[PDB]
Coordinates of C-alpha atoms and ligand atoms in Angstrom, one line a residue:
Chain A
X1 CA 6.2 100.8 76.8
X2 CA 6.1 97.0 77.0
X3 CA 8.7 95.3 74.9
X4 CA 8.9 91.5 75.7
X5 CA 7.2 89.4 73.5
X6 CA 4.9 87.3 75.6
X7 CA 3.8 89.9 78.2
X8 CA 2.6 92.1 74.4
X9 CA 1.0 89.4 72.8
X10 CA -0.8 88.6 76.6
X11 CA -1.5 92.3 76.9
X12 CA -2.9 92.4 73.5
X13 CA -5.7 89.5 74.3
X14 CA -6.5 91.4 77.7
X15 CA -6.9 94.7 75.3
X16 CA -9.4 92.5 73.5
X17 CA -10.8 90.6 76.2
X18 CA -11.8 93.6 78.2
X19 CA -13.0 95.5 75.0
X20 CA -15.3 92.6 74.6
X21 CA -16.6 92.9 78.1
X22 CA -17.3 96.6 77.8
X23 CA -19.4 95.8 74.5
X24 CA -21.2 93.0 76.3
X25 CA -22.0 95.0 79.1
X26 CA -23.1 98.0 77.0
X27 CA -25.7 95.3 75.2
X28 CA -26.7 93.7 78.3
X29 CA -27.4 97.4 79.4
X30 CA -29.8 98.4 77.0
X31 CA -31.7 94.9 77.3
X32 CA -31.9 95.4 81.4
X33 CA -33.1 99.0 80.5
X34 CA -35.9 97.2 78.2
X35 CA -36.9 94.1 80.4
X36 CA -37.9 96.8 83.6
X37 CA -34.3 96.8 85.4
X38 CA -32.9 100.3 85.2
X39 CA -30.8 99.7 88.6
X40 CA -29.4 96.5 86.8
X41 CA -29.0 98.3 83.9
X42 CA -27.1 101.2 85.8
X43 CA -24.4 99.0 87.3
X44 CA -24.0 96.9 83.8
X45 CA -23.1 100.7 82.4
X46 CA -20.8 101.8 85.3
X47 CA -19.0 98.1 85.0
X48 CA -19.0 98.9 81.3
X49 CA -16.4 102.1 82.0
X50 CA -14.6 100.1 84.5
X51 CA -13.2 97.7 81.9
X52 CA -12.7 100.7 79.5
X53 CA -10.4 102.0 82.4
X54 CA -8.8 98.4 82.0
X55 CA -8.6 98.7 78.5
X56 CA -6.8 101.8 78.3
X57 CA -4.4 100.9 80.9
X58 CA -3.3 98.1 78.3
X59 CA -3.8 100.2 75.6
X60 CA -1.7 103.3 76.7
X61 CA 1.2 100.2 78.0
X62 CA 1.3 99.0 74.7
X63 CA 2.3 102.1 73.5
X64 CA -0.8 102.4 71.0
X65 CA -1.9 106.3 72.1
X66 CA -0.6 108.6 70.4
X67 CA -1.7 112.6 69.4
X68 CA -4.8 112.7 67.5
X69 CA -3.4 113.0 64.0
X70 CA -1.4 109.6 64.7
X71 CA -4.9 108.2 66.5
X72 CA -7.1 109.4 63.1
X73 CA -4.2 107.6 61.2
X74 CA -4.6 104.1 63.2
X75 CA -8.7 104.6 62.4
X76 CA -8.3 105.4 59.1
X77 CA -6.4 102.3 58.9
X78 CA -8.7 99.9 60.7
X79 CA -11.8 101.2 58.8
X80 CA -9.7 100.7 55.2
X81 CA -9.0 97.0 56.8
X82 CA -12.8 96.0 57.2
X83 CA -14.0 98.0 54.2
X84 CA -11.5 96.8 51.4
X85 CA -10.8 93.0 52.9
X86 CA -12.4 92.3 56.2
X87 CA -16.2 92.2 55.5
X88 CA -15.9 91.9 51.7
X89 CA -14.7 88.4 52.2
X90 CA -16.7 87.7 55.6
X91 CA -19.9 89.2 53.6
X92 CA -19.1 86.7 50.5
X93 CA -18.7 83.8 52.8
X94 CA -21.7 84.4 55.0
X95 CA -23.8 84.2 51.7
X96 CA -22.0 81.3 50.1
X97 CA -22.9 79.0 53.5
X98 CA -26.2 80.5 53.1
X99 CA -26.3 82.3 56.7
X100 CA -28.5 85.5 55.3
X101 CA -28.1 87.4 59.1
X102 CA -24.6 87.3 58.9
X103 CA -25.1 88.8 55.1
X104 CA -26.9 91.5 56.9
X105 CA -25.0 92.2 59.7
X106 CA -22.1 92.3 57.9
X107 CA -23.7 94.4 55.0
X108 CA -25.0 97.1 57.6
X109 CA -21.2 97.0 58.8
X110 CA -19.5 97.4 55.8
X111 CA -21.9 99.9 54.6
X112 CA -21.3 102.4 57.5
X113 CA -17.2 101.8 57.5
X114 CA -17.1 103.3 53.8
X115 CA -17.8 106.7 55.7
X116 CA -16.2 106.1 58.9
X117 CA -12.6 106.2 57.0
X118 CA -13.7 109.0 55.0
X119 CA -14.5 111.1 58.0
X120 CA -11.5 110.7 59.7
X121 CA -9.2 111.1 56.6
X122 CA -11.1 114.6 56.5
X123 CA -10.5 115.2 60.4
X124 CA -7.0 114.1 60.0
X125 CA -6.3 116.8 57.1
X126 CA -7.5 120.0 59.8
X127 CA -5.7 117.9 62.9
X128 CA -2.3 117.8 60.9
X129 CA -2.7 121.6 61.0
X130 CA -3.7 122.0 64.1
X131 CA -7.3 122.6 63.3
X132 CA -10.7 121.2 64.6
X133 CA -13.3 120.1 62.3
X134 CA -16.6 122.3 61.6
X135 CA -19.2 119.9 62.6
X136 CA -21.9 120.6 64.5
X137 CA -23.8 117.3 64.9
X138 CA -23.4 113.6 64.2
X139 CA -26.3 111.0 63.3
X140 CA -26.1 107.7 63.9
X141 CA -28.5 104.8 63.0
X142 CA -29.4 102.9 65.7
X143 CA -29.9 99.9 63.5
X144 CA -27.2 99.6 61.2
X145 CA -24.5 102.3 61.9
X146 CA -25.1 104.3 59.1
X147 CA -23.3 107.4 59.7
X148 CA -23.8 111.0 59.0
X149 CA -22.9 114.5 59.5
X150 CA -24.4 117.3 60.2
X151 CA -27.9 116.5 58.4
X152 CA -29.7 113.3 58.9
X153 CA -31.4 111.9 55.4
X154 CA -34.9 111.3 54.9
X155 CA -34.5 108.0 56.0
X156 CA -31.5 105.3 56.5
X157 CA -30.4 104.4 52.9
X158 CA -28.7 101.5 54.1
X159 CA -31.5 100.0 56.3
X160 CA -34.5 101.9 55.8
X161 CA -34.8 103.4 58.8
X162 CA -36.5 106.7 59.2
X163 CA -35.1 109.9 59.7
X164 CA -36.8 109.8 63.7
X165 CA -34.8 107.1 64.3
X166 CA -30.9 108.1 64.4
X167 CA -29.2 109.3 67.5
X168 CA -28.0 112.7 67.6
X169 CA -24.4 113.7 68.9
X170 CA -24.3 117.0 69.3
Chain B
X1 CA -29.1 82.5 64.9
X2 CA -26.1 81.7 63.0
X3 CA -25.6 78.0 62.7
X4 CA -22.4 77.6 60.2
X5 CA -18.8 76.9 61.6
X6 CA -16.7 79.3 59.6
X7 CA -20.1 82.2 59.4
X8 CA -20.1 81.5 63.0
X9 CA -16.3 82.1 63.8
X10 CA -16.1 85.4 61.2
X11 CA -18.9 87.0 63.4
X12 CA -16.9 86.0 66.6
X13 CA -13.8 87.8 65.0
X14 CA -15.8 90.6 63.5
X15 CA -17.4 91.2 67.4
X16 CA -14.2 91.4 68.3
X17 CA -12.7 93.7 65.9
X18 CA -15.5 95.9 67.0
X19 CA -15.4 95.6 70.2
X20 CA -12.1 96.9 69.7
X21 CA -12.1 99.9 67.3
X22 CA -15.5 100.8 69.6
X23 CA -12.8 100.9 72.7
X24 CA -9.9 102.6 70.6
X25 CA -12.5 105.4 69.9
X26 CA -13.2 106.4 73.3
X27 CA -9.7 106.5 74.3
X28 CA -8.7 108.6 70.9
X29 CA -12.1 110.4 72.1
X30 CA -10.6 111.4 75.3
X31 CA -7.1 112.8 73.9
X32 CA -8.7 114.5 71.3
X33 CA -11.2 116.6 74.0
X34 CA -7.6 116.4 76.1
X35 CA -5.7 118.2 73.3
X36 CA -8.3 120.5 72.1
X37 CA -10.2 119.2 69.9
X38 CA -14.0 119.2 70.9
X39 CA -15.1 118.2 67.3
X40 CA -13.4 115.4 66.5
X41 CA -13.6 114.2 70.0
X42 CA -17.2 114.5 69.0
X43 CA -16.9 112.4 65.6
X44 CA -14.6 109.6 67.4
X45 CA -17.8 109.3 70.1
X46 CA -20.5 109.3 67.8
X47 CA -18.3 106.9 65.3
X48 CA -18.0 104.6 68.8
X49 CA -21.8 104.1 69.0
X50 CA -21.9 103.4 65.2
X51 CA -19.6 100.2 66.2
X52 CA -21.7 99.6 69.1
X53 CA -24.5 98.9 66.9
X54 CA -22.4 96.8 64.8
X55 CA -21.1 94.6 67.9
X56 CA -24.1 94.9 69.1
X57 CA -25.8 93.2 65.4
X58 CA -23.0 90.5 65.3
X59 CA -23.8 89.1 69.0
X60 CA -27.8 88.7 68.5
X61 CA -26.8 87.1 65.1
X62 CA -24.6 84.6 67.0
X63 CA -27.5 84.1 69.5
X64 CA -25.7 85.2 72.4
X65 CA -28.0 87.7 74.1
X66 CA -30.6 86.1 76.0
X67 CA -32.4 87.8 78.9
X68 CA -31.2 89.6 82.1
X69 CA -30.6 86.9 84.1
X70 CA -28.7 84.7 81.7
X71 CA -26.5 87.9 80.5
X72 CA -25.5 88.2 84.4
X73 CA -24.7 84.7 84.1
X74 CA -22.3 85.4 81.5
X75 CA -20.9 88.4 83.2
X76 CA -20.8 86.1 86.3
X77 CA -18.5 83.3 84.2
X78 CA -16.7 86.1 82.4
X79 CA -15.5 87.9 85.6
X80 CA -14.7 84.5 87.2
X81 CA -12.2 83.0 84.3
X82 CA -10.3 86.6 85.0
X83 CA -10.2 86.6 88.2
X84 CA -9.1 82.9 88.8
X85 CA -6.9 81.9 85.4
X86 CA -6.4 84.8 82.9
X87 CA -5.0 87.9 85.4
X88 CA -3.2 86.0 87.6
X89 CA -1.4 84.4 85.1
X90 CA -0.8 87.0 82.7
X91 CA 0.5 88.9 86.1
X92 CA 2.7 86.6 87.0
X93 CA 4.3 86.3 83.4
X94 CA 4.5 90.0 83.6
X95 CA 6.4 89.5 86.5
X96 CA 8.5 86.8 85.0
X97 CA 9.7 88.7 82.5
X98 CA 10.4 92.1 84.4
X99 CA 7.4 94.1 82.5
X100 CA 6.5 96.8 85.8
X101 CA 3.9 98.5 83.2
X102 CA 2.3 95.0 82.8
X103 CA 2.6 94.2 86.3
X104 CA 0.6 96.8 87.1
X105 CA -2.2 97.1 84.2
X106 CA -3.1 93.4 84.8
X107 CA -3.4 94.2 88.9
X108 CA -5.3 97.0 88.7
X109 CA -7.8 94.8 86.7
X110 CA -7.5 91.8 88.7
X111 CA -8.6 93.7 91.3
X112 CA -12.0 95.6 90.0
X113 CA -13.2 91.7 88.3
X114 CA -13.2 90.4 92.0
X115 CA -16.0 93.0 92.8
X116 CA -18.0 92.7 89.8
X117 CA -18.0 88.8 89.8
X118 CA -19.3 89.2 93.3
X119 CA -21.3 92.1 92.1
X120 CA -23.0 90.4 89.1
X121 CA -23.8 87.1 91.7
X122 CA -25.3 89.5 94.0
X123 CA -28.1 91.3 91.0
X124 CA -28.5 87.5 89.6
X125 CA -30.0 86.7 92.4
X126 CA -33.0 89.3 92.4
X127 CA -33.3 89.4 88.8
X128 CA -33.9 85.5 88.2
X129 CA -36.8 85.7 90.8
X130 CA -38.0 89.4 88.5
X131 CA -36.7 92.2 91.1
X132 CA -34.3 94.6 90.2
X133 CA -31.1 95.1 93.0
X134 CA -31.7 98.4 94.8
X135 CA -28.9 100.5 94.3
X136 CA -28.4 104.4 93.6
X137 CA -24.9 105.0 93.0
X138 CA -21.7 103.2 91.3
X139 CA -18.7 104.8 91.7
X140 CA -15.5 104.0 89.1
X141 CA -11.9 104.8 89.6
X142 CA -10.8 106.3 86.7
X143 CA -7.1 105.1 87.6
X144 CA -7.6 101.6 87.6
X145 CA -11.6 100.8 87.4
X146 CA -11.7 99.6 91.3
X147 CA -15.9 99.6 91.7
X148 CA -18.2 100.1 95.1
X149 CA -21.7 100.9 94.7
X150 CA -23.5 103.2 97.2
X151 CA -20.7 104.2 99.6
X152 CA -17.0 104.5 98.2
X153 CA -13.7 104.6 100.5
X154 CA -12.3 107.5 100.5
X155 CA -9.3 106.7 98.7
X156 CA -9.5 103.9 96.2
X157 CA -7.6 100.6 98.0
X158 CA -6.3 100.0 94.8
X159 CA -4.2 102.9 93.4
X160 CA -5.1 105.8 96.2
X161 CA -6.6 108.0 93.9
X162 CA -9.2 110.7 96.3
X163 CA -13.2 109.8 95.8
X164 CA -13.5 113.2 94.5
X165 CA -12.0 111.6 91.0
X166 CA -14.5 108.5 91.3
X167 CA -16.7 108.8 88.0
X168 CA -20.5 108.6 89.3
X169 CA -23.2 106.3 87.6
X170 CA -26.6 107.7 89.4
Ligands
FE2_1 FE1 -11.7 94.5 83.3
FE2_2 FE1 -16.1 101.9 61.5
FE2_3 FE1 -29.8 102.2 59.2
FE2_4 FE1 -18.0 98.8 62.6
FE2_5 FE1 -14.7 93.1 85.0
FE2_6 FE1 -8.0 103.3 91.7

């Protein structure tokens, strides 16, 4: 595990920098996929994993993996982060500069992290005990993020979206 | 698009926080499947997409995804400012300061971005006159994200890892 101060904190940024490229990459994908470029939009994806590769190699030098009851613990307290403090105040000052996307964007976010950290404080409860869950599917809104298990509503309650819409994990 | 300095910089740091629990989700995804977990692997992919939508909402509200030609562009300047300043020097700091985990994390990467500034450069080119590239397959090393698309080596030259490990994009 790395332990010097300045090769962390640079090992940190390249954690984030190439998490950044795999998202952009991932986006760009889809929009190749849209404009009529699936080879384009082939090697954008297979680039994508590439920098996850990167990314983990950081990640796992940083000492950050652990077993999945520790990993459940680190989302749980990432998701509690954004819900209670990050997007609150980023929500509240997106609307008092009057920048109504960013009161969206970070509404949809918000929104969807209330469950995220309450699905993996129930997966962390049967992984302490060295249980799986019992879920059989996962819908996802391809909109917002509004997450749900093993049902998808009648439509998005966060969005609007309808049920049609959400991307099954199964 | 968002216009206001500090709106503007909370959505930067909100696409980055992410970006990251996005990436930190397919890792924990991995060592949950790894450990015997199928379900929760499950939830911690599905959960991933959810952030990808996020991400995804924060960098159209910042105006940053244009078409296929200008994303290449960015994946073209993005590569580039790894390649020439960020790897090299947080290798050599690595080095610096004895870190042998570090040393070899930011190689491995350093690497794979020389192919995909060169490959990016190369699919600019027919996409800005409106072709797509012609390729069928992208092969990844799992070990270290080296990249060749259509033939591989039979060993990566990076880590040595067999072509029989390569992940396939087809
Ligand atoms: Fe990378
Ligand atoms: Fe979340
Ligand atoms: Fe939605
Ligand atoms: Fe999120
Ligand atoms: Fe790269
Ligand atoms: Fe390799």
């Amino acid at each position: 595990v790395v332990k010097r101060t300045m090769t962390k904190k640079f090992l940190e940024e390249a954690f984030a920098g190439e998490s950044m490229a795999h998202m952009r990459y991932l986006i760009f994908a889809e929009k190749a996929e849209q404009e009529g470029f699936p080879n384009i939009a082939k090697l954008f994806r297979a680039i994508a994993y590439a920098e996850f590769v990167h990314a983990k190699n950081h990640f796992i030098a940083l000492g950050k993996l652990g077993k999945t009851p520790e990993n459940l613990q680190m989302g749980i307290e990432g998701e509690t982060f954004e819900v209670e403090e990050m997007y609150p105040v980023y929500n509240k000052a997106a609307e008092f500069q009057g920048e109504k996307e960013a009161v969206r964007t970070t509404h949809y976010a918000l929104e969807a992290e209330k469950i995220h950290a309450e699905l993996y404080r129930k997966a962390k409860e049967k992984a302490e005990k060295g249980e799986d869950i019992e879920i059989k599917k996962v819908y996802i809104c391809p909109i917002c993020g509004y997450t749900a298990v093993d049902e998808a509503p009648e439509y998005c309650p966060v969005c609007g979206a309808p049920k049609e819409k959400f991307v099954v994990f199964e």
